[PDB]
Every structure is written in C-alpha cells, then in structure tokens.
Amino acid sequence: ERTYLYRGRILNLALEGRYEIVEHKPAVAVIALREGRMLFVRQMRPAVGLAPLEIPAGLIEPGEDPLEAARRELAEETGLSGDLTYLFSYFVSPGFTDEKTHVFLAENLKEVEADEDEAIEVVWMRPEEALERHQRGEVEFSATGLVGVLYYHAFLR
Amino acid sequence: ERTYLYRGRILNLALEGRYEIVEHKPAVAVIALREGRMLFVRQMRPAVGLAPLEIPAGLIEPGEDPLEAARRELAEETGLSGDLTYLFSYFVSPGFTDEKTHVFLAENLKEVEADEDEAIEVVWMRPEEALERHQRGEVEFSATGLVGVLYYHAFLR
Numbered sequence: 001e002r003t004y005l006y007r008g009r010i011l012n013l014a015l016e017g018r019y020e021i022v023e024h025k026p027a028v029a030v031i032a033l034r035e036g037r038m039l040f041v042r043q044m045r046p047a048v049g050l051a052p053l054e055i056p057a058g059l060i061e062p063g064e065d066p067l068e069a070a071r072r073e074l075a076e077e078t079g080l081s082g083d084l085t086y087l088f089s090y091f092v093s094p095g096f097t098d099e100k101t102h103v104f105l106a107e108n109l110k111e112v113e114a115d116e117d118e119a120i121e122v123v124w125m126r127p128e129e130a131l132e133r134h135q136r137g138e139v140e141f142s143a144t145g146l147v148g149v150l151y152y153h154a155f156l157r
Numbered sequence: 158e159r160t161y162l163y164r165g166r167i168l169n170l171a172l173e174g175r176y177e178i179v180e181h182k183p184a185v186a187v188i189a190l191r192e193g194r195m196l197f198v199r200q201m202r203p204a205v206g207l208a209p210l211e212i213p214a215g216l217i218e219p220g221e222d223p224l225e226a227a228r229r230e231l232a233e234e235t236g237l238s239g240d241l242t243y244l245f246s247y248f249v250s251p252g253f254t255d256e257k258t259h260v261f262l263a264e265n266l267k268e269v270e271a272d273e274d275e276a277i278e279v280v281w282m283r284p285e286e287a288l289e290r291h292q293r294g295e296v297e298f299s300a301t302g303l304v305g306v307l308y309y310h311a312f313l314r
C-alpha cells in the first residue's frame with residue numbers, strides 16, 4: 001500500500017510500510033562504436049554537481065516503446081541514427097527506485113541532423129581511454145557509461 | 158539552493174530550481190568468482206516487487222570507508238571474507254540521484270560465518286548462465302549484477 005508524499009515531473013516519492021520508494025519513468029541507453037571510439041555524452045547533472053561520462057540515454061515518453069525512445073534519444077542528443085539491437089536491461093538501484101534501463105547497441109551510424117540538443121556534449125572516446133581516465137580520477141561514470149565500457153571490453157574487441 | 162521536501166532514512170527528496178533530486182547514501186558492491194561461479198544475491202525488493210539478480214551490495218555506514226563497507230556487506234550477506242581490490246565507481250542514475258556505487262573485486266574467499274543474514278539468498282551462478290537466463294526473460298538484473306557479469310566477461314575469463 002503506497003502512500004504518496006510527492007508526485008513530480010520525473011519521479012514520485014512514496015512510503016510502503018517502512019520502505020521509501022521512488023517511482024521513476026523507465027529509461028533507455030545506447031552503446032555505439034565507430035572506428036574504435038565509443039559515443040559518450042556529458043551534461044551538467046545538478047543531482048551530482050558535475051558532468052559524468054554517460055552514453056546517450058533518455059526517458060521513455062508516453063506512447064513510446066524502448067526501441068523508439070532509443071532512436072529518439074540518439075538523434076536528439078547526437079544527431080545520429082543507426083541500426084539498433086536490444087541487449088539487456090537493469091534496475092538502476094532496486095533498493096529504493098523502480099527505474100529500469102533498457103540498453104541497445106547501435107551500428108552503422110549516420111548523421112541525420114546537424115548533434116542538435118546543445119546542452120549535451122558529444123564525446124567520442126576510445127573505451128580504453130575512458131576506463132584509464134576514470135582509474136586516474138579524471139572523470140566519473142554514470143552506470144550507463146560504465147556498462148558501455150564494460151560491454152565493449154567483453155564483446156566488441 | 159536545495160529545498161527539502163522529505164528527509165528520510167536512506168534518502169532525502171529535494172527541489173533545486175526545477176530539478177527533483179534524491180540524495181542517497183553511497184553504496185558498495187563486490188564482484189567475486191569461485192570455480193567459475195559468480196557470487197550473486199537475491200532478496201525481495203519492494204521498490205520493484207521482485208527479486209533481481211544482484212551482487213552483494215550495501216550502504217556505507219557512518220564512520221566507514223568503501224573498503225570497510227564492502228568487507229562488512231560481504232560477510233553479513235554471504236558469510237564470506239576475501240582479499241578486496243577497488244575496481245571503479247559509478248553514479249547509479251545521475252539525472253535524479255547522487256547515489257554513487259564503489260565496486261570491488263574479492264579473491265581468495267573464505268567462510269568466516271555460518272551466510273548469515275537470512276532474508277538474502279546466496280546464488281552462486283556461472284555468469285554465462287546469469288546472462289542467458291536474463292536474455293530468456295527468466296531473471297532481472299540490478300545494475301550491480303549486470304556490472305558483475307560484464308566485468309567477468311571482459312576481464313576474468
């Protein structure tokens with residue numbers, strides 16, 4: 001039996017007995033490799049006060065399914081389209097939120113727009129270099145960035 | 158300038174201008190391999206209404222640093238100790254929360270207690286089989302479970 005303390009724009013806060021639960025829209029993320037570089041993005045994230053290394057990601061909007069949201073996010077954040085394949089999903093932090101992320105691979109990328117959402121920085125970077133910069137403390141990862149780097153090292157070399 | 162709407166036990170909800178922000182304690186997670194099996198755990202997670210495949214994980218308590226929290230969580234959840242090495246960290250979902258997870262590798266595991274926290278199920282499973290069960294829809298992953306599986310395939314085979 002959830003009791004709602006806050007109903008917001010991209011989350012709700014509820015109590016369920018002693019549990020504090022954040023309801024959140026599902027998300028998508030896209031792993032894309034070109035010429036040995038992975039497609040990362042960075043943007044200021046007020047929750048953390050910095051810009052972590054992420055892969056293109058977004059929330060699924062009403063009416064959309066994960067594949068469609070992934071296509072849209074990739075185009076809006078980086079100006080690209082590609083051939084998308086579903087990989088796997090994960091709960092970001094199931095001890096307190098129901099946010100679920102669906103991860104896709106993109107191949108054969110083409111520019112469909114001149115990126116285009118300006119507050120997001122497109123960062124093509126070899127995943128080996130992203131991992132080294134992180135190990136040396138020079139950049140933070142989001143879960144989606146780390147998943148992209150680890151998936152590359154597992155399956156795309 | 159954060160304005161607090163809710164101060165809780167393991168999270169705070171704040172507004173910062175138009176942003177909804179969940180402050181949350183940092184976490185740790187431990188990747189451990191023995192005889193080709195990875196150490197997973199499962200427990201009911203009221204936020205998601207199911208028991209995803211996770212690796213042993215917990216919140217850092219007052220006074221502790223990540224390594225110490227990792228040692229404690231591994232012992233409390235699975236009854237084991239091992240030689241711990243820091244791997245990397247990630248923000249679970251930096252579009253709305255500051256929760257950061259520090260991930261460790263454990264080697265040379267030994268039983269120090271007869272597991273011991275009973276509401277957590279210890280699930281030794283080959284990571285190849287965890288990935289196959291997930292692909293067939295039979296189990297959900299947390300981020301920590303997925304990170305463990307991908308790290309194994311990248312670096313531990």
Ligand SMILES: Nc1ncnc2c1ncn2[C@@H]1O[C@H](COP(=O)(O)OP(=O)(O)OC[C@H]2O[C@H](O)[C@H](O)[C@@H]2O)[C@@H](O)[C@H]1O
Binds near residue numbers: 019093166204217256
């Ligand atoms: N939503 C909640 N609200 C209130 N208290 C909680 C909640 N969940 C657990 N507790 C209490 O807090 C104690 C927490 O148990 P520990 O093992 O240190 O942490 P973890 O495994 O939950 O979370 C570790 C990470 O794994 C997941 O990804 C999480 O989202 C975290 O990112 C519990 O025993 C309960 O008493």
Ligand SMILES: Nc1ncnc2c1ncn2[C@@H]1O[C@H](COP(=O)(O)OP(=O)(O)OC[C@H]2O[C@H](O)[C@H](O)[C@@H]2O)[C@@H](O)[C@H]1O
Binds near residue numbers: 009010047177250
């Ligand atoms: N905390 C917030 N509160 C209010 N509105 C927000 C917030 N953050 C962004 N917006 C608004 O909502 C729109 C969201 O932009 P989209 O690209 O679909 O999602 P994403 O990249 O943020 O999140 C994708 C995932 O990546 C991260 O891991 C996240 O935590 C998610 O798990 C914004 O343009 C803002 O207008």
Ligand SMILES: [Mn+2]
Binds near residue numbers: 056058073077
């Ligand atoms: Mn985005």
Ligand SMILES: [Mn+2]
Binds near residue numbers: 057058073076077
């Ligand atoms: Mn977007």
Ligand SMILES: [Mn+2]
Binds near residue numbers: 213215216230234
């Ligand atoms: Mn735990």
Ligand SMILES: [Mn+2]
Binds near residue numbers: 214215233
């Ligand atoms: Mn615990």
